[PDB]
């Protein structure tokens, strides 16, 4: 057993190889952590779910820089990425004092969708359902030519774009944490830290405390 | 198990045998006494150590003597 991704290392035991997105890269044997048959499927669903959210997130950050919907600028002000999530929360009930409910409304509708998908994840994990990971049947415009599941070529594209999006969105969030520039502005400023656009502090501010004392703190 | 002994002062009254709650004792034939019988302890693995036999014995000092020893499930009286 030799993995393709790492030729010297032994191939991951649990991974089938017939699964979409498999290049043999599981050095830490996370696939084998739970003995249950459904656990590998749980991992695949998680990856696609992590990918799908990330894909939206990546585009959303870019699009938010490109333009904003009418009237949003007036209420929020000039906050850019995670800062808008914080500002909205300040102006919503329970989280803060205000007349807004954007974050709460998103959570309520996403939560209703996630409870239904959760039942699906449980059923797939115990083997009751034949559904493969991520196959919720959402293909309104025909693309799979009769199956919503899609061809192996397309699912490879979804998995790889989702992985790439996870890395990209993480970079964008982290770059907003110090430069406060946002995706497009940071791209324009290839030499950065020379100029920093001010950004309001995140709801989790303890994590940004070791910049000045242990790290250089160039910004 | 407990150790149960019968000494040759036994008058063969069978009272120890009737009083034993665990069928440890029985009567065997013996020419020593008038009754023609002596008590015996063939099943001491079942002896719980109650000493009802010693209470029943009428000889001046007990012909039957119980010596409490190692404890087992049987001799501890454990139904669990």
């Amino acid at each position: 057993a030799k993995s393709k991704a790492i030729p010297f290392l032994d191939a991951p035991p649990a991974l089938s190889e017939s699964m979409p997105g498999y290049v043999g890269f599981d050095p830490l044997w996370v696939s084998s952590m739970l003995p249950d048959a459904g656990y590998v499927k749980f991992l695949q669903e998680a990856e696609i779910k992590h990918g799908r959210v990330a894909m939206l997130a990546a585009a959303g950050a870019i699009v938010q820089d490109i333009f904003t919907f009418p009237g949003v600028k007036s209420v929020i002000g000039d906050v850019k990425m995670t800062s808008v999530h914080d500002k909205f929360l300040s102006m919503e009930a329970g989280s803060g004092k205000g007349d807004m409910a954007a974050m709460h409304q998103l959570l309520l509708w996403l939560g209703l969708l996630e409870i239904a998908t959760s039942v699906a994840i449980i059923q797939s994990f115990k083997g009751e359902t034949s559904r493969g990971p991520g196959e919720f049947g959402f293909d309104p415009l025909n693309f799979g030519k009769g199956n919503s599941a899609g061809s192996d070529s397309y699912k490879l594209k979804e998995i790889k774009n989702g992985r790439l999006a996870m890395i990209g969105i993480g970079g964008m969030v982290h770059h907003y944490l110090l430069t406060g520039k946002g995706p497009l502005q940071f791209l324009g400023g290839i030499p950065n830290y020379k100029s920093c656009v001010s950004h309001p502090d995140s709801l989790l501010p303890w994590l940004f405390k070791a910049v000045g004392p242990v790290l250089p703190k160039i910004c | 198990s407990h150790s149960v002994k019968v000494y040759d002062t036994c008058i063969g009254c069978t009272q120890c045998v009737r009083a034993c709650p665990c069928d440890v004792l029985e009567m065997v034939s013996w020419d020593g006494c008038k009754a023609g019988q002596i008590a015996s302890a063939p099943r001491t693995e079942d002896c719980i150590g109650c000493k009802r036999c010693e209470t029943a014995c009428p000889t001046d000092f007990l012909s039957v003597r119980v010596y409490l020893g190692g404890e087992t499930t049987r001799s501890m009286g454990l139904a669990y």
Partner: protein
Amino acid sequence: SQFIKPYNDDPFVGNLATPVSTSSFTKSLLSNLPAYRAGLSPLLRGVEIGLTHGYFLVGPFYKLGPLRNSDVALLSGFFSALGLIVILVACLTIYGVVSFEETEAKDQLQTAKGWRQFTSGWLVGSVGGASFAYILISNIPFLQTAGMSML
């Protein structure tokens, strides 16, 4: 009608069939708990039990511990809960060593391999549930008080 009967048709076993003991509702709960639920590996049983127990453990330590009035109360509550979990994992480990002899089978809790899997799952789940409770309490002011933020 009579609601109390001998246990599993046996009049001389040391148990009775009472509504608390053997009703359909009681049977449904017991059979669906992680300890008894079918189709679960011993490790997964440990994970689900661990998540539940570790999650509730944080709260009493945090609200009622020695550092409760300090601003480090949640960190103290997590560490004390984690300390208790480490001790409990050792209790599980020593029990496994004495109770079960080594055999090939690993699919059941009452086996040496199975008990070891249960301990591994319970440790990870307890750390994970205590960590989840820590994140939730750290961020949400309702949980930090007893709901007293509303008044």
